[PDB]
């Protein structure tokens, strides 16, 4: 019962690509709880987006996202070289639990 974000995604520097993830009506379909976690490999994961489209202090305004029912997205406008880390989605069910997506490692070249 995990979310369904794809394997990987690629982007040239300067592009504006998107990362999608689907789910069910208890994961994403009703609730405004969806978060994203950038995780460099020798590093603890750092959160990039709050509830649907909000954003932590220190995180640049390059990161954004939206929700379209069961499907949540993440659009990185202006890819730089330091976006070379996988992005794990997150959600909170109606049941009370927490799920994370599969992970999309993003290369920059």
């Amino acid at each position: 019962s995990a979310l369904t974000q794809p394997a990987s995604v690629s982007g040239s520097p300067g592009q504006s690509i998107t990362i999608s993830c689907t789910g069910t009506s208890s994961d994403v379909g009703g609730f405004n709880y969806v978060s994203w976690f950038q995780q460099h490999p020798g590093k603890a994961p750092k959160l990039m987006l709050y509830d649907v489209t909000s954003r932590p202090s220190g995180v640049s305004s390059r990161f954004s996202g939206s929700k379209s029912g069961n499907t949540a997205s993440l659009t990185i406008s202006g890819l730089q070289a330091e976006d070379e880390a996988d992005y794990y989605c997150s959600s909170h069910t109606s049941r009370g639990t927490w799920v994370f997506g599969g992970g999309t490692k993003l290369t920059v070249l």
Partner: protein, 495 residues
């Protein structure tokens, strides 16, 4: 120009006050706006799309019962206890059989029995619901001065294709050659969702009332209930046959589909398959025409010798259409279209495609106009090549005033209080009429709803008969607004 041939027309005229006009437009109605300048446009709502619905309750239609079993127990020593009474899949029913020595118990009395069978499912329906945001209305704005073969078609683009949301804005439509029309549409008060459930059976779909949809006896399931085993009111699709006072048994009640197409006599059918499209309802508009050009100044007047390639055809209440085709030089030009009486002294009847021009000489132009009652002489060109065509609009009278009255009361029958649009804020008459119509509307509705085609006529004859017998001049109190109005509404419902 997409508006000719549609039997619901609703010519609206007057940009008075500021530079705006109120219009309200349906799906099966294309509205034409006229003005002293500001060329005539055509507005038709083509579709309504609700984007992301979430189902709330899943009824089921046809089921089957397996693993059927029963269990009985001796008289006066308690109810039976079956092992799979613990699941809420199995539908249960306790009743009393007759037991004795032949059954192998003793005491010769009425025992107890229980019966269970697992309730699976075969055919569901989904009741999907939307909130009045995240849904758009597609509306098409086709200007006049028709080019070759564009009269009433929908195939192929001839006008702008603006989408309007409740999230939207001024919504500038930038018509090519013409100006820029802006529409302050209000989609939230249009069709009143949150009381609408987008019901969806096997390959069809409807638009049903919410409280009607929740009060519907079939075994249901919540819309978020994955692994749909726990059907809730399963006793409306099973029955328990205890004919004599002996062995009882379960039989499924059958597919409720044909009794569901009879449940929906009044649900306007929609399309929920590759998109949750609707083709019913309406929205009112605020139509601002502050920036519109006529496209025809700095085009010199023509030099005659036109030629007609499609004759005068009165399409539906005196709005004749001619397709002339121009022969001559100076091909960007206005045309000399006038409608006279017999001797060319007075101009009678307006032109509707105001300022018709010719572009690309070997391509005809459609000309729509409105003749008066009687003889009229349609005139194109100048004197060396004059076309003086005859037309007799079939001479009515104030009969078009009585059918404009019947059209107006019809539009007050479909549209409740939004029908006080098509008017550019008369103020002391339009707003007070809309306000008292909302007061008398909410005392009509929720005190006369639930009854149908026949009962409205019956109660209307009862109120009319009571009014024709009372005293203290309450006769005209109980006829002119509650009697005859409920007979007229009694015959115009079930549209």
């Amino acid at each position: 120009m997409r508006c000719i041939g549609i039997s619901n027309r609703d010519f609206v005229e007057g940009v008075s006050g500021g530079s705006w006009v109120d219009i309200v437009l349906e799906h099966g109605s294309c509205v034409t706006t006229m003005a002293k300048n500001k060329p005539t446009l055509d507005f038709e709502l083509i579709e309504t799309e609700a984007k992301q619905p979430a189902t709330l309750r899943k009824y089921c239609i046809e089921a089957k019962l397996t693993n059927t079993t029963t269990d009985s127990r001796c008289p006066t020593q308690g109810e039976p206890s079956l092992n799979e009474e613990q699941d809420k899949r199995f539908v249960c029913k306790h009743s009393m059989v007759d037991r004795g020595w032949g059954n192998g118990c003793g005491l010769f009395g009425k025992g107890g029995i229980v019966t269970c069978a697992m309730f699976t499912c075969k055919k569901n329906m989904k009741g999907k619901v939307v909130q009045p945001e995240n849904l758009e209305y597609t509306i098409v704005i086709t200007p006049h001065s028709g080019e070759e073969h564009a009269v009433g078609n929908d195939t192929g683009k001839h006008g702008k294709e603006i989408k309007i949301t409740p999230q939207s804005s001024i919504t500038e439509a930038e018509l090519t050659g013409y100006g820029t029309v802006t529409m302050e549409c209000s989609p939230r008060t249009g069709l009143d969702f949150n009381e609408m459930v987008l019901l969806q059976m096997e390959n069809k779909a409807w638009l049903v009332h919410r409280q009607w949809f929740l009060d519907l006896p079939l075994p249901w399931l919540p819309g978020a209930d994955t692994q749909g085993s726990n059907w809730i009111q399963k006793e409306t699709l099973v029955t328990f046959k205890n004919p004599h006072a002996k062995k009882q048994d379960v039989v499924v009640l059958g597919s409720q589909e044909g009794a569901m197409h009879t449940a929906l006599t009044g649900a306007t059918e929609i399309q929920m398959s590759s998109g949750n499209l609707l083709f019913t309802g309406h929205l009112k508009c605020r139509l601002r025409m502050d920036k519109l050009q006529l496209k025809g100044m700095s085009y010199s007047m023509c030099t005659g010798k036109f030629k007609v390639v499609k004759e005068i055809a009165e399409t539906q209440h005196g709005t004749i259409v001619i397709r002339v085709q121009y022969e001559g030089d100076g091909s960007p030009c206005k045309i000399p279209f006038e409608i006279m009486d017999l001797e060319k002294r007075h101009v009678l009847g307006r032109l509707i495609t105001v300022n018709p021009i010719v572009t690309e000489k070997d391509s005809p132009v459609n000309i729509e106009a409105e003749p008066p009652f009687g003889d009229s002489y349609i005139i194109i060109g100048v004197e060396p090549g004059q076309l003086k065509l005859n037309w007799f609009k079939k001479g009515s009278s104030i009969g078009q005033m009585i059918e404009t009255t019947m059209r107006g009361a019809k539009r007050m029958a479909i549209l409740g209080d939004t029908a006080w649009d098509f008017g550019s804020l008369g103020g002391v008459f339009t707003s007070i009429g809309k306000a008292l119509h909302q007061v008398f509307g909410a005392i009509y509705g929720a005190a006369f709803s639930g009854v149908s085609w026949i009962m409205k006529i019956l109660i209307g004859v009862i109120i009319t008969w009571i009014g024709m017998n009372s005293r203290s001049t309450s006769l005209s109190v109980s006829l002119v607004l509650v009697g005859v109005v409920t007979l007229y509404l009694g015959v115009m419902v079930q549209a």
